[PDB]
Amino acid sequence: MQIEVLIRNITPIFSAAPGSYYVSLDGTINPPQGASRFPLTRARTMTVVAETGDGVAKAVPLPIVPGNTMRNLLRRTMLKDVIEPALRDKSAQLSIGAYATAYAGNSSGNPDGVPSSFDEIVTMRAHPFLGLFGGGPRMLQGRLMVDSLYPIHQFSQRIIGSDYINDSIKGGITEIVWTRRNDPILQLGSPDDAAVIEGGAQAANDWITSLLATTKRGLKAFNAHEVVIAGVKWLWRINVDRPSESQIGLILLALNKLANQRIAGGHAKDYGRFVIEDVILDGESVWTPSGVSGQATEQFFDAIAEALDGMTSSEFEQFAASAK
Amino acid sequence: MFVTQVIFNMGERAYPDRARAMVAELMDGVQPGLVATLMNYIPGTSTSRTEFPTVQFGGASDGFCLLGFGDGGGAIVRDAVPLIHAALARRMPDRIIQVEHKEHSLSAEARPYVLSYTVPRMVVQKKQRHAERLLHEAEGKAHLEGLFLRSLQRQAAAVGLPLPENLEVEFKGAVGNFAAKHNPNSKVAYRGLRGAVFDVNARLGGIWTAGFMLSKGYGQFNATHQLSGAVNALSE
RNA sequence: GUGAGCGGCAUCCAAGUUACGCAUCAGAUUCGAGACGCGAGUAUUUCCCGCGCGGGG
């Protein structure tokens, strides 16, 4: 059962690509040596094949949010906003291992390595939450397929299709954001400011001498990081392998309450803020201005409510239990 | 190749001569080698060197500044500035001293036309007769151009920077004159020039020195910043 | 004129048939492009210095 979510971000998305890439001024990637050089944090990109109105296929980088990040975002949103209040209403406490397993798919770095009994397999897969994601010490295959957040772009036509060709963007959608780190030494101009500091101006000057002598690290740093520009429209594709009504209702509730969560990175700079523009369920739009609602979706919400009001921590503690 | 400039933010414009006197005064006795190196003294004696000084002082708008020339100048300023900073902190217990450390690359490339270069502080007064010779450009050009050329070549040789063999300079003039003294009670004074404009057919990168007797704080000028032409904002 | 002399190990033959590298994981947290470049000085002198000449306010 395919779910397509049309996501428009009102703040830049910042998913940092691992590695210390260096930039000069005026935004030249990997500049020639000799010029000024600064560490640049490149946004996460995936190379995809697309024809840019030429007819020949070529691989080009595309700034995306990795699918694992979106899967974890969905998991966390579901847990905080739906399941956790349900457990708190019944005053049921999760064990520490159960909490870790529900929040990261496993309670430790050592998988059990042995299979599961069939009754336990079906019990865990029928669960509204554990069935979707799975994991645990003994490995279990979840029902949830989460794809990466592909931006609607001329490079994404060969991937997402021509259904959303009306929202494509031609040019690049990434920009460099420059940041600093200023010492408190510059903003001291009078000892009156330093009335809160031990030893006063003498101690401050001693510290500044230490900084100039033996620290080099220091509290001065001019750096930059690449962000995906705001306002670009994204497509999120979610697939489920033969789910029950309760699981679909849970996913719909998470989508309803997803807007309260950031996508990735830039917590300090309010990065990752988005609004869900359109949700499509098996080729049919179920989104409303209020949210996921309508007669076509009432049964899922009823089923997920009936699952939530009568769920306990027993399933979680059994799932997190290891057979070693 | 590299020029290091360090500025101490004391909060008031102090003339370079008194600045050098006081920095000498603070380091009396402690670390004698640092004193001998910073004061440009022959090892074993307190006399100064006639040779071009690798230690440089200048009058910052907010205080006084130390300038090192070459690797030796850079090394001496590097191991010196913490000591002078500590001494200044010791003497001024209720003021924050701030240190600004910036390096300039030194480069001099030829150029088939001339550019407007000026300095706030020239030592041009040698004889009183030559002082009145400035009315006519022809009479006063010879010694001024000779001074500029010799100063440039000697500082280049001191820093080991290649210079073209075909430098010709013509003088334009200065804004006014000023008087300077060893001490406020001294009765001996010299005449300098402010805004001494001369045109050279080459590029001067970084901060530069012209004239002679520079350690006391004369003849320093940032030719690179002057090329930006920020001298327009001078009005009341 | 060596118990010598003379004398094909040769023909034919299938290593092939079946098997999922798969299941489960947030590149996250922190930091100012704003500060800095002589715009304030108020005129004749000595012991020694590089050495007639070049020099220390």
Coordinates of C-alpha atoms (C1' of nucleotides) in Angstrom, one line a residue:
Chain A
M1 CA 0.0 0.0 0.0
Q2 CA 1.8 3.0 -1.3
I3 CA 1.8 6.4 0.5
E4 CA 3.2 9.5 -1.2
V5 CA 3.6 12.6 1.0
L6 CA 4.1 16.0 -0.7
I7 CA 6.4 17.9 1.7
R8 CA 7.2 21.6 1.3
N9 CA 9.9 22.9 3.7
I10 CA 9.6 26.4 5.0
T11 CA 13.1 26.4 6.4
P12 CA 16.3 25.0 4.9
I13 CA 17.0 21.3 5.3
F14 CA 20.5 20.5 6.6
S15 CA 21.6 16.9 6.4
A16 CA 25.4 16.9 6.8
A17 CA 27.4 14.6 4.5
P18 CA 30.2 12.9 6.4
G19 CA 33.7 14.2 5.6
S20 CA 35.7 17.4 5.8
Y21 CA 35.2 19.1 2.5
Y22 CA 36.9 22.5 2.2
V23 CA 35.7 25.6 0.5
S24 CA 37.3 29.0 -0.3
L25 CA 35.5 32.3 -0.4
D26 CA 32.8 32.9 -3.0
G27 CA 31.8 29.2 -2.7
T28 CA 34.3 27.3 -4.8
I29 CA 34.1 23.6 -4.0
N30 CA 37.6 22.1 -3.2
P31 CA 39.5 25.3 -4.3
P32 CA 43.0 25.4 -5.8
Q33 CA 45.8 25.4 -3.1
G34 CA 47.2 28.7 -2.0
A35 CA 43.9 30.6 -1.6
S36 CA 42.0 30.9 1.6
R37 CA 40.6 27.5 2.7
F38 CA 37.7 26.8 5.1
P39 CA 36.0 23.6 6.2
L40 CA 32.7 23.2 4.4
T41 CA 29.9 20.8 5.5
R42 CA 28.3 19.5 2.4
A43 CA 24.6 18.6 2.4
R44 CA 23.8 14.9 1.9
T45 CA 23.6 14.1 -1.7
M46 CA 22.8 10.9 -3.7
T47 CA 23.9 10.5 -7.3
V48 CA 20.9 9.6 -9.6
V49 CA 20.5 9.0 -13.3
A50 CA 18.3 11.5 -15.2
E51 CA 18.0 13.0 -18.7
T52 CA 18.0 16.8 -18.6
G53 CA 16.2 17.3 -21.8
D54 CA 19.0 15.8 -23.9
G55 CA 18.0 12.2 -24.2
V56 CA 21.3 10.8 -22.9
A57 CA 21.4 9.3 -19.4
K58 CA 24.0 10.6 -16.9
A59 CA 24.5 10.4 -13.2
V60 CA 24.3 13.8 -11.3
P61 CA 24.3 14.6 -7.6
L62 CA 20.9 15.3 -6.0
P63 CA 20.6 16.8 -2.5
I64 CA 18.4 14.4 -0.5
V65 CA 17.5 13.5 3.0
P66 CA 18.6 9.8 3.6
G67 CA 15.7 7.4 3.9
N68 CA 17.0 6.1 7.3
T69 CA 16.7 9.6 8.7
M70 CA 13.0 9.8 7.6
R71 CA 12.3 6.3 8.9
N72 CA 13.7 7.2 12.3
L73 CA 11.8 10.5 12.2
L74 CA 8.6 8.6 11.5
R75 CA 9.4 6.2 14.4
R76 CA 10.1 9.0 16.8
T77 CA 7.1 11.0 15.8
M78 CA 4.9 7.9 16.2
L79 CA 6.3 7.1 19.6
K80 CA 6.3 10.6 21.2
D81 CA 2.9 11.7 19.8
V82 CA 0.8 8.6 19.7
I83 CA 2.1 5.5 21.5
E84 CA 3.8 7.1 24.5
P85 CA 0.6 9.1 25.6
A86 CA -1.3 5.8 25.2
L87 CA 1.1 4.1 27.6
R88 CA 1.1 7.0 30.0
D89 CA -2.7 7.0 30.2
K90 CA -2.6 3.4 31.4
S91 CA 0.4 4.2 33.7
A92 CA 2.4 1.4 32.1
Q93 CA 6.2 1.5 32.4
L94 CA 8.5 0.3 29.7
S95 CA 11.7 -1.5 30.8
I96 CA 15.0 0.2 29.9
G97 CA 15.8 -2.5 27.3
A98 CA 12.2 -2.2 25.9
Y99 CA 12.7 1.5 25.6
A100 CA 16.0 1.2 23.8
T101 CA 14.6 -1.5 21.5
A102 CA 11.5 0.5 20.6
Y103 CA 13.6 3.7 20.0
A104 CA 16.5 2.2 18.0
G105 CA 15.4 -1.3 16.9
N106 CA 17.7 -3.2 19.3
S107 CA 18.7 -3.2 23.0
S108 CA 22.4 -3.9 22.3
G109 CA 25.0 -4.2 19.6
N110 CA 24.9 -8.0 19.6
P111 CA 22.1 -9.6 17.6
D112 CA 20.7 -12.8 19.1
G113 CA 21.2 -14.7 15.8
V114 CA 18.5 -17.3 16.4
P115 CA 15.1 -17.3 14.7
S116 CA 11.7 -16.8 16.4
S117 CA 8.8 -19.1 17.1
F118 CA 5.9 -18.7 14.7
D119 CA 3.4 -17.6 17.3
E120 CA 5.8 -14.9 18.5
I121 CA 6.6 -13.9 15.0
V122 CA 2.9 -13.3 14.2
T123 CA 2.2 -11.6 17.5
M124 CA 5.0 -9.1 17.0
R125 CA 4.1 -8.5 13.3
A126 CA 0.4 -7.9 14.1
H127 CA 1.4 -5.2 16.6
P128 CA 0.6 -1.6 15.5
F129 CA 4.2 -0.5 16.1
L130 CA 6.6 -3.5 16.3
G131 CA 5.1 -4.9 13.1
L132 CA 6.0 -1.8 11.1
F133 CA 9.7 -1.5 12.1
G134 CA 10.8 -4.7 13.8
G135 CA 14.3 -5.3 14.9
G136 CA 15.0 -6.5 18.4
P137 CA 17.8 -8.9 19.5
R138 CA 16.5 -11.7 17.3
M139 CA 16.1 -10.1 13.9
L140 CA 12.6 -9.4 12.6
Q141 CA 11.5 -8.0 9.2
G142 CA 9.2 -5.0 9.6
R143 CA 6.3 -4.2 7.3
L144 CA 7.4 -0.6 6.7
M145 CA 9.4 0.5 3.7
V146 CA 10.6 4.1 4.0
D147 CA 12.2 5.9 1.0
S148 CA 14.5 8.9 1.0
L149 CA 13.1 12.4 0.7
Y150 CA 13.7 13.0 -3.0
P151 CA 13.3 16.7 -3.9
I152 CA 11.1 17.3 -6.9
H153 CA 13.6 18.4 -9.5
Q154 CA 14.6 17.9 -13.2
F155 CA 17.1 15.4 -11.9
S156 CA 14.3 13.5 -10.1
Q157 CA 12.0 13.0 -13.0
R158 CA 13.5 9.6 -13.9
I159 CA 13.0 8.5 -10.3
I160 CA 9.7 9.8 -9.0
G161 CA 8.0 10.1 -12.4
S162 CA 6.2 12.8 -14.3
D163 CA 3.2 12.9 -11.9
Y164 CA 4.6 16.0 -10.1
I165 CA 6.1 17.7 -13.1
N166 CA 4.2 20.9 -12.2
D167 CA 6.3 21.4 -9.1
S168 CA 9.8 20.8 -10.6
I169 CA 12.7 23.2 -10.1
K170 CA 15.3 23.7 -12.8
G171 CA 18.4 25.2 -11.0
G172 CA 20.3 24.1 -8.0
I173 CA 18.7 24.1 -4.6
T174 CA 21.7 24.2 -2.3
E175 CA 23.4 27.2 -0.7
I176 CA 26.3 27.7 1.7
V177 CA 25.7 29.2 5.1
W178 CA 28.7 30.9 6.9
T179 CA 29.1 30.9 10.7
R180 CA 31.6 32.2 13.1
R181 CA 32.8 31.8 16.7
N182 CA 33.7 35.0 18.6
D183 CA 35.9 35.1 21.7
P184 CA 34.5 37.0 24.8
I185 CA 37.8 38.9 24.7
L186 CA 36.6 41.2 21.9
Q187 CA 33.4 42.2 23.7
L188 CA 35.2 43.2 26.9
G189 CA 35.9 46.9 26.7
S190 CA 35.4 47.9 30.3
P191 CA 36.1 46.2 33.7
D192 CA 32.5 46.9 34.7
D193 CA 31.4 44.1 32.3
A194 CA 34.1 41.9 34.0
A195 CA 32.7 42.5 37.5
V196 CA 31.2 39.0 37.2
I197 CA 34.5 37.4 36.4
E198 CA 37.0 36.0 38.9
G199 CA 40.3 37.9 39.2
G200 CA 38.9 40.7 37.0
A201 CA 41.0 42.2 34.3
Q202 CA 44.2 40.6 35.5
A203 CA 42.8 37.1 35.3
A204 CA 41.2 37.9 31.9
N205 CA 44.6 39.1 30.6
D206 CA 46.2 36.0 32.0
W207 CA 43.7 33.8 30.2
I208 CA 44.2 35.7 27.0
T209 CA 48.0 35.2 27.3
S210 CA 47.4 31.5 27.8
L211 CA 45.2 31.5 24.7
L212 CA 48.0 33.2 22.6
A213 CA 50.7 30.9 24.1
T214 CA 49.7 27.3 24.6
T215 CA 46.1 26.7 23.6
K216 CA 47.0 25.9 20.0
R217 CA 42.5 24.9 20.3
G218 CA 40.6 28.2 20.9
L219 CA 37.2 29.8 20.6
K220 CA 37.6 31.4 17.2
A221 CA 36.3 29.5 14.2
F222 CA 35.0 30.7 10.8
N223 CA 33.2 27.8 9.0
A224 CA 30.4 27.1 6.6
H225 CA 27.9 24.4 5.7
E226 CA 25.7 23.7 2.7
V227 CA 21.9 23.7 3.1
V228 CA 19.1 22.9 0.8
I229 CA 17.2 26.1 0.1
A230 CA 13.8 26.7 1.6
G231 CA 10.5 26.4 -0.3
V232 CA 11.6 23.5 -2.6
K233 CA 8.9 20.8 -2.8
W234 CA 9.8 17.2 -1.8
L235 CA 8.2 13.8 -2.4
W236 CA 8.3 11.1 0.3
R237 CA 7.3 7.6 -0.6
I238 CA 6.3 5.0 2.0
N239 CA 5.3 1.4 1.3
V240 CA 3.8 -1.2 3.6
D241 CA 3.8 -5.0 3.1
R242 CA 0.1 -6.1 3.6
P243 CA -0.7 -4.1 6.8
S244 CA -3.6 -4.4 9.1
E245 CA -6.1 -1.5 9.6
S246 CA -4.5 -0.6 12.9
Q247 CA -1.0 -0.1 11.4
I248 CA -2.4 2.1 8.5
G249 CA -4.2 4.2 11.1
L250 CA -1.0 4.5 13.1
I251 CA 0.9 5.7 10.1
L252 CA -1.8 8.2 9.2
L253 CA -1.8 9.5 12.8
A254 CA 2.0 9.9 12.7
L255 CA 1.6 11.8 9.4
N256 CA -1.0 14.0 11.1
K257 CA 1.4 14.8 13.9
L258 CA 4.6 14.8 11.8
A259 CA 4.6 18.6 11.2
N260 CA 5.6 19.2 14.8
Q261 CA 9.0 17.5 14.2
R262 CA 12.1 18.7 12.4
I263 CA 13.5 16.7 9.5
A264 CA 17.2 16.6 10.0
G265 CA 20.0 18.8 11.6
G266 CA 20.2 22.4 12.4
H267 CA 18.3 22.3 15.7
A268 CA 20.0 25.5 16.8
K269 CA 19.1 27.3 13.5
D270 CA 15.5 26.0 13.3
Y271 CA 16.5 24.0 10.2
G272 CA 14.3 21.2 9.0
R273 CA 10.8 22.8 9.4
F274 CA 8.2 21.6 6.9
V275 CA 4.5 21.5 6.2
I276 CA 2.8 18.4 4.8
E277 CA 1.1 19.6 1.6
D278 CA -0.6 16.5 0.2
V279 CA -0.9 12.9 1.3
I280 CA -1.8 10.3 -1.3
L281 CA -3.1 6.8 -0.3
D282 CA -2.9 4.2 -3.1
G283 CA -3.2 6.8 -5.7
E284 CA -6.1 8.6 -3.9
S285 CA -5.6 11.9 -2.0
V286 CA -6.8 11.6 1.6
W287 CA -5.3 14.9 2.8
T288 CA -7.5 17.7 4.0
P289 CA -6.6 21.2 5.2
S290 CA -7.1 20.0 8.8
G291 CA -5.0 16.9 8.1
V292 CA -5.5 13.3 7.2
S293 CA -9.3 13.0 7.4
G294 CA -12.3 11.8 5.4
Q295 CA -14.8 9.0 5.1
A296 CA -12.2 6.9 3.2
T297 CA -10.0 7.1 6.3
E298 CA -12.4 6.7 9.2
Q299 CA -12.0 2.9 9.5
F300 CA -8.2 3.2 9.9
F301 CA -8.6 5.8 12.7
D302 CA -11.2 3.7 14.5
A303 CA -9.0 0.6 14.3
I304 CA -5.9 2.4 15.5
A305 CA -7.9 3.9 18.4
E306 CA -9.2 0.5 19.3
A307 CA -5.6 -0.8 19.2
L308 CA -4.2 2.0 21.3
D309 CA -6.8 2.0 24.1
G310 CA -6.0 -1.6 24.8
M311 CA -2.3 -2.0 24.4
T312 CA 0.2 -2.7 27.1
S313 CA 4.0 -2.9 27.7
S314 CA 3.9 -6.7 27.7
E315 CA 4.4 -6.8 23.9
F316 CA 7.4 -4.4 24.1
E317 CA 9.1 -6.3 27.0
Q318 CA 8.6 -9.6 25.2
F319 CA 10.0 -8.2 22.0
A320 CA 13.1 -6.7 23.7
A321 CA 13.8 -9.9 25.6
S322 CA 16.9 -11.8 24.4
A323 CA 17.1 -15.6 24.2
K324 CA 20.8 -15.8 24.9
Chain B
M1 CA 58.2 37.6 2.8
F2 CA 55.9 37.8 5.8
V3 CA 55.3 40.8 7.9
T4 CA 53.7 40.5 11.3
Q5 CA 51.8 43.4 12.9
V6 CA 50.6 43.3 16.5
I7 CA 48.4 46.0 18.0
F8 CA 47.9 46.5 21.7
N9 CA 44.5 48.1 22.5
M10 CA 45.2 50.4 25.4
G11 CA 42.3 52.8 24.6
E12 CA 44.2 55.9 23.8
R13 CA 46.4 57.2 20.9
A14 CA 49.9 57.1 22.3
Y15 CA 52.7 58.5 20.2
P16 CA 55.2 55.8 19.0
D17 CA 58.3 57.4 20.7
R18 CA 56.7 57.3 24.2
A19 CA 55.4 53.8 23.4
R20 CA 58.9 52.5 22.7
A21 CA 60.2 54.3 25.8
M22 CA 57.6 52.7 28.0
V23 CA 57.9 49.2 26.6
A24 CA 61.6 49.5 27.2
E25 CA 60.8 50.7 30.8
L26 CA 58.5 47.8 31.6
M27 CA 60.9 45.1 30.7
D28 CA 63.8 46.4 32.8
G29 CA 66.0 43.5 34.0
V30 CA 63.6 40.6 33.4
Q31 CA 64.6 38.5 30.4
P32 CA 67.6 40.7 29.3
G33 CA 67.9 38.8 25.9
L34 CA 64.3 39.9 25.0
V35 CA 65.2 43.5 25.8
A36 CA 68.4 43.4 23.7
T37 CA 66.6 41.8 20.8
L38 CA 63.6 44.1 20.9
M39 CA 65.6 47.3 21.3
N40 CA 67.9 46.4 18.3
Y41 CA 71.1 46.2 20.4
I42 CA 74.4 44.7 19.7
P43 CA 75.0 41.6 21.8
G44 CA 76.8 42.7 24.9
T45 CA 76.0 46.4 24.5
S46 CA 73.0 48.7 24.9
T47 CA 73.8 50.7 21.7
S48 CA 71.4 50.7 18.8
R49 CA 72.3 49.6 15.3
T50 CA 72.7 51.9 12.3
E51 CA 71.5 49.1 10.1
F52 CA 67.9 48.9 9.1
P53 CA 65.9 47.9 12.2
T54 CA 64.0 44.6 12.1
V55 CA 62.0 45.8 15.1
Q56 CA 59.2 48.3 14.2
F57 CA 56.9 50.6 16.1
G58 CA 54.0 52.5 14.9
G59 CA 51.2 54.8 16.1
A60 CA 47.9 53.0 16.0
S61 CA 44.7 55.0 16.2
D62 CA 43.8 53.1 19.4
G63 CA 47.3 52.6 20.7
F64 CA 50.7 51.4 19.5
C65 CA 51.7 48.5 17.3
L66 CA 54.6 46.1 16.9
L67 CA 55.8 45.1 13.5
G68 CA 58.1 42.2 12.7
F69 CA 60.0 41.9 9.4
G70 CA 61.1 38.5 8.0
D71 CA 61.3 35.2 9.8
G72 CA 63.5 36.8 12.5
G73 CA 61.1 39.7 13.0
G74 CA 58.2 37.3 13.1
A75 CA 60.0 35.0 15.6
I76 CA 60.9 37.9 17.9
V77 CA 57.4 39.4 17.9
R78 CA 56.0 36.0 18.5
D79 CA 58.0 35.2 21.6
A80 CA 57.9 38.9 22.7
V81 CA 54.2 39.9 22.7
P82 CA 53.1 37.6 25.6
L83 CA 55.8 39.2 27.8
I84 CA 54.9 42.8 26.9
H85 CA 51.2 41.9 27.3
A86 CA 51.9 40.6 30.8
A87 CA 53.9 43.7 31.7
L88 CA 51.2 46.0 30.5
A89 CA 48.6 44.0 32.5
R90 CA 50.9 44.3 35.5
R91 CA 51.2 48.1 35.1
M92 CA 47.6 48.8 34.3
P93 CA 45.5 46.8 36.7
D94 CA 42.1 48.3 35.8
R95 CA 42.2 48.2 32.0
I96 CA 41.8 45.4 29.6
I97 CA 44.6 45.2 27.0
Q98 CA 43.7 43.6 23.7
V99 CA 46.1 42.1 21.1
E100 CA 45.4 42.1 17.4
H101 CA 47.6 39.8 15.3
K102 CA 47.6 40.2 11.6
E103 CA 50.2 39.1 8.9
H104 CA 50.8 40.8 5.5
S105 CA 52.4 39.2 2.5
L106 CA 55.2 41.4 1.1
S107 CA 55.2 41.7 -2.7
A108 CA 56.4 44.3 -5.1
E109 CA 55.6 43.8 -8.8
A110 CA 56.2 46.3 -11.7
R111 CA 53.5 48.1 -13.6
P112 CA 53.9 50.2 -16.7
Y113 CA 52.0 53.2 -15.2
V114 CA 52.1 54.9 -11.8
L115 CA 49.8 54.7 -8.8
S116 CA 49.1 57.3 -6.0
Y117 CA 51.0 56.3 -2.8
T118 CA 51.2 58.5 0.2
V119 CA 52.5 58.3 3.8
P120 CA 51.5 60.2 7.0
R121 CA 55.0 60.3 8.4
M122 CA 58.1 61.3 6.4
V123 CA 61.5 62.3 7.9
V124 CA 62.5 64.9 5.3
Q125 CA 64.0 67.7 7.3
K126 CA 67.8 67.5 6.9
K127 CA 68.8 71.2 6.3
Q128 CA 66.7 74.3 6.7
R129 CA 67.8 75.5 3.2
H130 CA 66.3 72.4 1.6
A131 CA 63.0 73.0 3.6
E132 CA 62.3 76.2 1.5
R133 CA 63.4 74.4 -1.7
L134 CA 60.1 72.6 -1.8
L135 CA 58.5 75.6 -3.5
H136 CA 60.1 74.4 -6.8
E137 CA 59.6 70.8 -7.6
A138 CA 62.9 70.5 -9.6
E139 CA 65.2 71.6 -6.8
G140 CA 63.6 69.4 -4.1
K141 CA 62.9 66.3 -6.1
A142 CA 66.5 65.1 -6.2
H143 CA 67.0 64.4 -2.5
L144 CA 63.4 63.3 -1.9
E145 CA 63.5 60.7 -4.8
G146 CA 67.0 59.6 -3.7
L147 CA 65.7 59.1 -0.2
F148 CA 62.7 57.1 -1.3
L149 CA 64.8 54.9 -3.7
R150 CA 67.5 54.2 -1.1
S151 CA 65.0 53.4 1.6
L152 CA 63.1 51.0 -0.7
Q153 CA 66.2 49.2 -1.8
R154 CA 67.7 48.9 1.7
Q155 CA 64.4 47.6 3.2
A156 CA 64.1 45.2 0.2
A157 CA 67.6 43.9 0.8
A158 CA 66.9 43.6 4.5
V159 CA 63.7 41.5 3.8
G160 CA 65.2 39.8 0.7
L161 CA 62.4 40.8 -1.7
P162 CA 63.1 41.1 -5.4
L163 CA 62.5 44.5 -6.9
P164 CA 62.6 45.6 -10.5
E165 CA 65.7 47.4 -11.8
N166 CA 63.8 50.2 -13.5
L167 CA 61.9 52.1 -10.7
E168 CA 61.4 55.8 -11.3
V169 CA 59.4 58.0 -8.8
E170 CA 58.2 61.6 -9.0
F171 CA 56.9 63.5 -6.0
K172 CA 53.6 65.3 -5.7
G173 CA 53.6 67.0 -2.3
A174 CA 52.4 66.8 1.3
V175 CA 49.6 68.2 3.3
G176 CA 51.4 69.9 6.1
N177 CA 54.2 69.9 8.7
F178 CA 54.4 68.8 12.3
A179 CA 56.9 68.9 15.3
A180 CA 58.1 66.0 17.4
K181 CA 60.2 65.8 20.5
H182 CA 62.1 63.2 22.5
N183 CA 60.3 64.1 25.7
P184 CA 57.6 66.7 26.5
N185 CA 60.2 68.9 28.2
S186 CA 62.7 68.5 25.4
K187 CA 63.6 71.7 23.4
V188 CA 64.8 69.7 20.3
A189 CA 62.3 69.1 17.5
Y190 CA 62.2 67.9 13.9
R191 CA 60.0 68.5 11.0
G192 CA 58.0 65.8 9.1
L193 CA 55.5 65.7 6.3
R194 CA 51.9 64.4 6.4
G195 CA 50.4 63.1 3.2
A196 CA 53.6 63.0 1.2
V197 CA 52.3 61.8 -2.1
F198 CA 54.7 60.1 -4.6
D199 CA 53.9 58.0 -7.7
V200 CA 55.7 54.7 -8.4
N201 CA 55.4 52.5 -11.4
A202 CA 55.0 49.3 -9.3
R203 CA 52.7 47.6 -6.9
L204 CA 53.4 47.4 -3.2
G205 CA 51.7 44.7 -1.3
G206 CA 51.3 44.7 2.5
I207 CA 52.7 47.3 4.8
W208 CA 55.8 49.2 3.8
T209 CA 58.5 51.4 5.2
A210 CA 60.1 54.5 3.6
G211 CA 62.6 57.1 4.8
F212 CA 65.1 56.4 7.6
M213 CA 65.0 56.2 11.4
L214 CA 61.9 54.0 11.5
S215 CA 62.1 52.2 14.9
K216 CA 60.9 55.3 16.7
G217 CA 57.7 55.1 14.6
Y218 CA 58.3 57.1 11.4
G219 CA 57.9 56.1 7.8
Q220 CA 55.4 53.3 8.2
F221 CA 52.6 53.1 5.7
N222 CA 50.1 50.5 4.5
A223 CA 50.4 50.8 0.7
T224 CA 47.9 48.0 0.2
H225 CA 45.1 49.7 2.2
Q226 CA 45.8 53.0 0.4
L227 CA 45.1 51.5 -3.0
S228 CA 41.6 50.9 -1.8
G229 CA 41.2 54.7 -1.9
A230 CA 39.4 55.1 1.5
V231 CA 40.9 58.6 2.0
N232 CA 37.6 60.2 0.8
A233 CA 36.0 60.1 4.3
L234 CA 37.9 63.1 5.7
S235 CA 35.6 65.9 6.6
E236 CA 33.7 67.6 9.5
Chain C
rG1 C1' 77.4 -62.1 -34.7
rU2 C1' 76.3 -57.7 -26.2
rG3 C1' 70.5 -64.8 -24.2
rA4 C1' 71.5 -60.9 -29.1
rG5 C1' 68.0 -60.0 -33.0
rC6 C1' 61.9 -58.6 -34.0
rG7 C1' 57.4 -56.2 -30.9
rG8 C1' 52.1 -49.0 -30.1
rC9 C1' 49.2 -50.0 -23.7
rA10 C1' 45.5 -49.2 -27.3
rU11 C1' 40.7 -48.4 -28.1
rC12 C1' 35.3 -45.9 -25.6
rC13 C1' 33.3 -42.3 -21.3
rA14 C1' 29.5 -35.0 -19.3
rA15 C1' 31.2 -33.7 -13.0
rG16 C1' 26.4 -32.6 -13.5
rU17 C1' 21.8 -31.6 -11.1
rU18 C1' 19.0 -28.1 -7.0
rA19 C1' 20.0 -23.2 -3.2
rC20 C1' 17.7 -15.1 -1.9
rG21 C1' 23.6 -12.0 1.7
rC22 C1' 19.1 -11.2 4.0
rA23 C1' 16.9 -9.2 8.1
rU24 C1' 17.4 -4.5 12.1
rC25 C1' 20.2 1.2 12.5
rA26 C1' 18.7 10.0 12.7
rG27 C1' 25.5 12.8 10.8
rA28 C1' 23.6 14.4 15.2
rU29 C1' 24.7 18.1 18.8
rU30 C1' 27.7 24.1 19.4
rC31 C1' 29.2 28.5 18.1
rG32 C1' 28.1 37.4 15.6
rA33 C1' 31.3 38.8 9.1
rG34 C1' 32.2 42.1 12.8
rA35 C1' 36.3 44.3 14.2
rC36 C1' 40.8 46.4 12.9
rG37 C1' 45.1 50.9 9.1
rC38 C1' 49.1 57.1 12.4
rG39 C1' 42.2 62.2 11.6
rA40 C1' 45.5 64.3 18.6
rG41 C1' 52.6 66.3 17.9
rU42 C1' 54.1 72.4 17.7
rA43 C1' 61.5 73.3 15.8
rU44 C1' 67.9 72.6 16.7
rU45 C1' 71.4 68.9 19.5
rU46 C1' 76.2 64.6 22.0
rC47 C1' 78.7 60.9 24.0
rC48 C1' 79.4 57.3 21.1
rC49 C1' 77.9 55.0 16.5
rG50 C1' 78.3 52.7 10.4
rC51 C1' 84.3 54.1 9.8
rG52 C1' 86.1 63.0 4.1
rC53 C1' 80.7 60.7 3.6
rG54 C1' 76.8 57.7 6.0
rG55 C1' 73.6 58.3 12.6
rG56 C1' 70.7 57.8 17.6
rG57 C1' 64.6 60.9 19.9

